[PDB]
Design a protein around this ligand. Structure first.
Ligand code: NI
Length: 341
């Protein structure tokens, strides 16, 4: 049955709750972003209103085949009335089309649901600054102090320099980047740009990228692999076996692969700097794991919450164990005592 943390009290609304059948008393189903754990359950046979961003709407229509009549896109940063309740969608700094939702309840309560997000100081000068938030439904993916990682700008710097150096030394090297969902497009677009290449991929992945309103996208991607020296592959193919196999297919055009695995956090984060990352090598193939995160670090999360000063926090991630829940509640209390709300 639908868990409490996907229900919005005082409304007929739910958030990211599509895998429980018809939810009793739900008049509108919100979807924060197009990631499979969140959309799980939607299909072409859904007949209830779905509220979401323009980008998320493009993906529901084209990839899941949800019918146009049930898709309700809303612009960002705009006060909108939905079934007689005022709502605003805010950029979540997660994957393309990902949003946070502000709900202004008829009784005067204000609720923020972050969806998935990577907190940024820029959110402190959005429409959030303008009034008080009583309840916060929080993306707690990395709510523990061990979780550090560098900025997205730092990680992209490392990738661009790694690739540019390798291909300038060997013009017959191929670059491959793994993907399994939307998000992290900057990794492969930034590498292709420095190499003066389009990025080549499958027809299914090109279709997905054509939904994302990225400017000048036609100039940046292609289905013709042979014209391109940056290829995308399924993340499951990023290993020595899959890559050797892939190199055979290029028909003696390249003699080296350099590959990037964008991971979330990994325990090598607790010791090693981004400057000092090293690849896994077998022969003419090298695989780099790079810590490109689209979720808040512990410090970024703590700063956001201490700025917002919510009256109540409801976690939406790591809620399945008692030890996880207890751990999070302890951090929330420290933060509140340190900052004085
Ligand atoms: Ni996500």
């Amino acid at each position: 049955t639908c868990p409490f943390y996907k229900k919005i009290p005082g409304t007929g609304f739910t958030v990211d709750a599509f895998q429980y059948g018809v939810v009793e008393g739900c008049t509108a189903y919100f979807l924060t972003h197009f990631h499979s754990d969140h959309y799980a359950g939607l299909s072409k046979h859904f007949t209830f209103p779905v509220y979401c961003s323009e980008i998320t709407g493009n993906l529901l229509k084209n990839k899941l085949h949800v019918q146009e009549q049930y898709i309700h896109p809303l612009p960002l940063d705009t006060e909108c009335i939905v079934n007689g309740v005022k709502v605003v969608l805010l950029d979540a700094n997660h994957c393309p089309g990902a949003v946070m939702i502000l709900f202004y309840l008829p009784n005067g309560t204000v609720i923020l649901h972050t969806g998935d997000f990577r907190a940024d100081p820029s959110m402190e000068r959005s429409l959030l600054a303008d009034q008080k938030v009583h309840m916060l439904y929080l993306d707690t993916t990395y709510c523990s102090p061990e979780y550090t990682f560098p900025s997205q700008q730092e990680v992209i710097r490392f990738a661009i320099n790694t690739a540019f150096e390798a291909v300038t030394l060997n013009p017959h090297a191929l670059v491959v980047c793994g993907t399994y969902s939307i998000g992290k497009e900057k990794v492969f677009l930034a590498i292709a740009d420095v190499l003066g290449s389009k990025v080549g991929m499958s027809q299914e992945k090109y279709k997905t990228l054509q939904c994302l309103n990225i400017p000048e996208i036609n100039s940046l991607i292609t289905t013709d692999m042979c014209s391109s020296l940056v290829h995308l592959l399924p993340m499951m193919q990023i290993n020595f076996k899959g890559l050797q196999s892939h190199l055979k297919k290029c028909g003696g055009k390249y003699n080296q692969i350099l590959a990037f695995r964008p991971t979330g956090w990994t325990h090598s984060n607790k010791f090693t700097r981004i400057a000092d990352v090293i690849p896994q090598t077998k022969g003419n193939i090298s695989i780099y794991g790079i810590p490109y995160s689209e979720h808040s670090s512990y410090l970024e999360m703590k700063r956001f919450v201490q700025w917002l000063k919510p009256q109540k926090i409801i976690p939406t991630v790591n809620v399945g164990t008692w030890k996880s829940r207890s751990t999070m509640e302890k951090y929330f209390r420290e933060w509140k005592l340190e900052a004085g709300y």
